């Protein structure tokens, strides 16, 4: 199916002394493959998946250099943005950046993105066409003009349609054994009673990859959303994901209710019953 490469960067200013805390992570699909943390000892980009370890010392030198450049742009940005917004030196502030590319089942370019936030709000983002910018306010509008003059969009577009896609394909091939494998959810159902009239049914999906999944209840063959609780998809910690959906039902009527599970690792949707 489709695939992505995405990088996520957070910098948090430390007012009293020194440079900001900087954390960078890279993902292929739902798999983290690299990291840099400014508070760690190595001051190098670090592997987080075995297949990226195939890369040679030049890759690690080149990635380290770039990630440090990312860090310094963020450092400068925090000062510029404090200036744009007339803020003091006392408070802590945050910049967040995410960029990357999508490819479809054919591994051809589908979509590219580059978005930027200050204190948890939209600041500026590259538009879908990769030719123009969305600036949320007048501070971001000043950045937009700066970036138009410097032809920033043009450089980003070349990366997003070129290098990004080229290297995602490369990672997908080298990590084929896990990255191109689907892990179907392991499903089961639990039952609890609150009183002698009311029961809770919980439909579980465990150990699945990719993260994307749909879990729903039906009652007598029709979609049931009232009296349901659906939790956020959560990491198991071993690379796979978990989720559940519960429904409250009258004791004795459990049989009317079916759980339905859709996942790319399942050629057909699965049905569970109590």
């Amino acid at each position: 199916g489709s695939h992505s490469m995405r990088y996520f960067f957070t910098s948090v200013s430390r007012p009293g002394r020194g440079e900001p805390r900087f954390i960078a992570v890279g993902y292929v699909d739902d798999t983290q493959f690299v990291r840099f943390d400014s508070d760690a000892a190595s001051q190098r980009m670090e592997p987080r998946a075995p297949w990226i370890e195939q890369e040679g010392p030049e890759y690690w030198d080149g990635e380290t250099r770039k990630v440090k450049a990312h860090s310094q742009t963020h450092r400068v940005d925090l000062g510029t943005l404090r200036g744009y917004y007339n803020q003091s030196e006392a408070g802590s502030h945050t910049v967040q950046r995410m960029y990357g590319c999508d490819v479809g089942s054919d591994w051809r370019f589908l979509r590219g993105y580059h978005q930027y936030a200050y204190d948890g709000k939209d600041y500026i983002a590259l538009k879908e066409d990769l030719r123009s910018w969305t600036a949320a306010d007048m501070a971001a509008q000043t950045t937009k003009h700066k970036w138009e003059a410097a032809h920033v969009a043009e450089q980003l577009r070349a990366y997003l349609e070129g290098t990004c896609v080229e290297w995602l394909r490369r990672y997908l091939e080298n990590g084929k054994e896990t990255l191109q494998r689907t892990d179907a959810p392991k499903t089961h159902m639990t039952h609890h009673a609150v009183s002698d009239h009311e029961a809770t049914l919980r439909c579980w999906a465990l150990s699945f990859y990719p993260a994307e999944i749909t879990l729903t209840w039906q009652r007598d063959g029709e979609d049931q959303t009232q009296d349901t609780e659906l939790v956020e998809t959560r990491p198991a910690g071993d690379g796979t994901f978990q989720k559940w959906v519960a429904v409250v039902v009258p004791s004795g009527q459990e049989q009317r209710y079916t759980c339905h599970v859709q996942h790319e690792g399942l050629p057909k949707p699965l049905t569970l019953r109590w």
């Binding site: 990088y7 890279g26 990635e63 770039k66 990630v67 450049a69 990312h70 742009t73 400068v76 940005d77 510029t80 943005l81 960029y99 930027y116 600041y123 500026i124 950045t143 700066k146 970036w147 410097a150 920033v152 450089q155 980003l156 990366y159 290098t163 990004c164 080229e166 290297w167």
Partner: peptide, 9 residues
């Protein structure tokens, strides 16, 4: 593979 250049805001 990270983007080569990151323009300042």
């Amino acid at each position: 593979n990270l983007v080569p250049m990151v323009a300042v805001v």
